[PDB]
Design an enzyme around this catalytic site. Structure first.
Site, PDB file in Angstrom:
ATOM      1  CD  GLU A 146      21.274 -22.516  -9.237  1.00 38.72           C
ATOM      2  OE1 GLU A 146      21.511 -21.387  -8.755  1.00 38.72           O
ATOM      3  OE2 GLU A 146      21.911 -23.544  -8.905  1.00 38.72           O
ATOM      4  CG  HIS A 162      22.742 -27.535  -8.453  1.00 38.73           C
ATOM      5  ND1 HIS A 162      21.984 -27.168  -9.544  1.00 38.73           N
ATOM      6  CD2 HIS A 162      22.412 -28.822  -8.181  1.00 38.73           C
ATOM      7  CE1 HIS A 162      21.245 -28.195  -9.930  1.00 38.73           C
ATOM      8  NE2 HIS A 162      21.485 -29.210  -9.118  1.00 38.73           N
ATOM      9  CB  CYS A 183      20.673 -31.297 -11.474  1.00 37.31           C
ATOM     10  SG  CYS A 183      20.507 -32.181  -9.912  1.00 37.31           S
ATOM     11  N   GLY A 203      17.496 -34.536  -9.246  1.00 38.72           N
ATOM     12  CA  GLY A 203      18.157 -35.179 -10.360  1.00 38.72           C
ATOM     13  C   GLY A 203      17.157 -35.763 -11.333  1.00 38.72           C
TER      14      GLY A 203
END
Length: 187
Positions: A77, A46, A153, A151
């Site tokens: 991911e 992401h 992250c 976070g």
């Protein structure tokens, strides 16, 4: 847990931080990047790295981006990047387990401009997923107690000499990371 038994684990983490864990920024925000070997590094998906990401304030070209999938085709991911610099990363693949591993006294290494050289002890790292008939987990994220808020992250989850996973999210009570295995970086 500042105590003696944590010695070797903390050492490995401090080391990994220095040689391999780097501050990063993309159009998406600030992230913790892990260099694997040569010009290879992993980011959380992401973070959607462009053609150019910021690495410790030096701007770098990204020559190859590739999201990763386990042997079952599931989306892990994690985006696996190829950087355009002469510098090589110490190859740490040797600290990534043969196959996805849980841990008992793990710590999370975070390193972004907004949160530099942060070590957070996360305790027990667990596997949370389904069972393919007969057994063996398909669809798998690791998770641990992590009561904060999305976070940072990117984190790196380490135990005693093992690089265990990449933090990819949370829910305000738990944090989840993409379990790592040596195979994902064989190329």
């Amino acid at each position: 847990p500042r105590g003696s038994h944590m010695g070797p684990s903390l050492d490995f983490a401090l080391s990994l931080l220095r040689r391999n864990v780097r501050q990063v920024q993309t159009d998406q925000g600030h992230f913790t990047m892990l260099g694997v070997r040569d010009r290879l590094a992993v980011l959380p998906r992401h973070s959607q790295p462009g053609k150019t990401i910021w690495i410790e304030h030096k701007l770098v070209n990204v020559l190859d981006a590739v999201e990763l999938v386990d042997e079952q085709g599931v989306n892990l991911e994690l985006t696996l990047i190829t950087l355009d610099t002469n510098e090589k990363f110490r190859d740490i693949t040797k600290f990534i387990p043969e196959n996805i591993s849980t841990a008992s006294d793990a710590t999370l290494v975070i390193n972004t401009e907004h949160m530099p050289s942060m070590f957070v002890p996360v305790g027990d790292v667990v596997q949370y997923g389904f069972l393919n008939l007969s057994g063996k987990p398909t669809h798998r994220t690791m998770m641990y107690n992590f009561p904060t808020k999305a976070g940072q992250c990117g984190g790196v989850v380490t135990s005693v000499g093992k690089i265990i996973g990449i933090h990819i999210g949370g829910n305000g009570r738990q944090g989840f990371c993409a379990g790592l295995k040596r195979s994902y970086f064989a190329s």
